[model samples]
Target: LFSQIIWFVDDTNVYRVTIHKTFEGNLTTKPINGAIFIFNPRTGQLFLKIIHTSVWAGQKRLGQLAKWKTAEEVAALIRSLPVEEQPKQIIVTAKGMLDPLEVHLLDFPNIVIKGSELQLPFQACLKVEKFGDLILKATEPQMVLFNLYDDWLKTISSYTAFSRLILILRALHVNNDRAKVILKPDKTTITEPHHIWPTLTDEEWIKVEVQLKDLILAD
Candidate 1:
């Protein structure tokens, strides 16, 4: 029905909604979106555009995800790549649950998350979203680059890897498949940062992949 777009990404991370599903009713949940992580192929730059959910969930201890002496260390990992790929001045957007935690993120080196909360055209959101599907669909972090092939666009309707993304495009009728998903490549292989769930242990990730997939697609 349309042209083929070979979406090439240096890295990609699939962010899921933190808010418990029980919280929101049927209609509201439909509006809620997670987020996508993408690394700049040109400069290795990254952006963390967020919607609702809260800065509180990702603050302190386990929520912080990665290591940061004061917390908020997504930028440090940027150095893992060459200076050539390093983001000139990285940017991310997330909500501020509290004054203290929101302000603390200001100290982040090199990487800076702008607009603690704002509405902009550069925003993206998750639809169905899954790590189990992401694992099955995405290229291995060993050496291959993540490829969003045309065939994998729409599969099982709920499978993220091969079938997940179509949901976003699904909402949009034909002639409109513009998916603005920009997620940081969370999966790292030391050599390549194109892996999944660096924050999870093998056993822990196992549970999430299995449990979450069914949770979203359960009948």
Candidate 2:
């Protein structure tokens, strides 16, 4: 089935996240040179190339990722409140720095965030692991913040109050990595899935849908 991710929001922040790992597979094989596409929502005016994205991979640790930017990169910094606070500075540093981008959020094996003031909810629905196939379903009933377990840094760079975070989520196991490829937009058109694309499972498709809906459209 074709995986379709839907984006929804109220009046403030627009939340979106891709629960699937297709991006890593596709973008890695081909260069995804497009930026954020801003829709007026009210006027239906199409704004393209709103943000510029650069994907740099380093050791999967803070010492490496932290080199590019630091905790201070956050637009507004506040120590993660009470229960959400960690015991060390590095951990806290990672969370505050990575909250804007969810890549570092995957560094943590387990994490939870709670607050009524939160911009979006970190929530997902998955079908139990099946021997061969599984269907994952995600729906945007309302706005929710994700309870991420790792640190974060900005993955997208632009001068907009709102930025879109593209998540390359993997199943950790059982997915084929060798087949992944990134396709560039050749001197043609700017559309998704490019010429070469990622093969997402039903479950991965659902996760991508969830992420697309988890975007925080804040200023």
Candidate 3:
């Protein structure tokens, strides 16, 4: 008996798995019997998350699901559900977060991941125990800052607006430096920072947002 938390995000380009059931043993060919479980290595668990089942719908992408969920929270919610209506539970944990718009630093972590092969697949394995030593403690101020930022963002999940964030930043503006720090996407700049903005000072970030608003208005 808990509130169903649904947070939507625009996470394009992702991989998804679907399970189908038929009279024959080929589970892949039949219609989808129920929801699928997605897994993440770092969390060390499978997640029995929901999936749409219908002939019209093909293999639905996991990220495409409007609502992004925390696996542990979802699992606990499922365990609390009644048995008769329950379906097959597959525990999966994807590299996901309650905050999808931000860099998702909690999911990515400060550690770098090296692969055995030169070209790696979109996803890889992770072990929580292996990361025990390198994991950041919750007591750190930055960590507290990170959580505060995440929670504040999460509260505004219901507001389905694209440019409304501009207003929030305007209201909560502390200094130009804070803007610069916020604009930086939390990713490595491999060959000139592909996924994020170029490094900026606080003042520079405020200048960048002026240009950013123009870009958004042009759309």
Candidate 4:
């Protein structure tokens, strides 16, 4: 199975964590560079590490068959981050032959898994195909804003008003300074899974709608 973790940090950092799980019998393992891929989205920097996992010397009933890393462990890393640096939203896309693993992300109140497949519901509305150059030109904070806005649009039921609302907000969000807006895209994204809205109160949403409408008129 393949899992892609999209992590958004203060609209400044985009962390994509990948892990490939495979099962096998016991065999002696050797060390290499160590398995880890660090892709720095802002600077276009990357580092690839390779490592080996195999049988051990100490006897413990069963031998090492697979590298064990759980969703909970991944969550813990997020938890360890400074409160201000913590992610505003996390979209986990899982695919292939297995059921979804239960994790403690609910405890954090910031994570919202997208789905098994990656779907671009706002492809046409947001003109996401044109997003490539914008993303390349955008600052780190702007990148975060675009990603969150794009994902938020994908979560809602399709509607002309909703589409327009997001489009206007996107313009406002992108035009603003870095880290100026505190966006919680998961407020809409998590409703399906938890059946509740935890961020962006109704009154707050209404205010934003009014603000957006005024902006549209001004433009």
The numbered model that scores best in lDDT is 4
Candidate 4 C-alpha lDDT tens digits along 1-219:
112234411111122122444476445433211122222222222222222222222434221211122233345555666766544444333331111213446666554543334322221222222333333343322112222222333434324323433444354444332111322334353223221122454555555556555554555
Stretches of candidate 2 off by over 4 Å are 1-68, 76-168, 172-219
> To one decimal, what is the Cα RMSD in angstroms of model 3 from the true structure?
18.0
In model 4, where do residues sit more than 4 Å from their true spots?
1-70, 96-102, 116-219
TM-score of 2: 0.18
TM-score of every candidate relative to the true structure: 0.29, 0.18, 0.23, 0.28
Which prediction has more favorable lDDT, 1 or 2?
Answer: 1
lDDT of 1 by residue, 1-219 (tens): 011111111111222333434544543222122223433322212343222334224454422331122122233344355655544443233332223223544543443333323121112222223323333343322112233322223332213332333332232222122221111123442212343212333454344445433433442
Model 2 over residues 141-160: C-alpha lDDT tens digits? 11112212111112211211
Please state the error at residue 125 of candidate 1 in Å. 6.7
Clashing pairs in 3: 38-92, 40-93, 46-91, 46-92, 47-91, 47-92, 48-90, 176-202, 177-202
For each of the candidates, the C-alpha root-mean-square deviation to the true structure, in angstroms, is 15.7, 19.1, 18.0, 17.2
Ranking by TM-score: 1, 4, 3, 2
Give the whole-model CA lDDT for all candidates, comma-separated: 0.30, 0.24, 0.30, 0.33
Worst 10 residues of 3 by lDDT: 140-149
Residue 161 of model 4, lDDT score: 29
lDDT value, residue 25 of candidate 3: 65
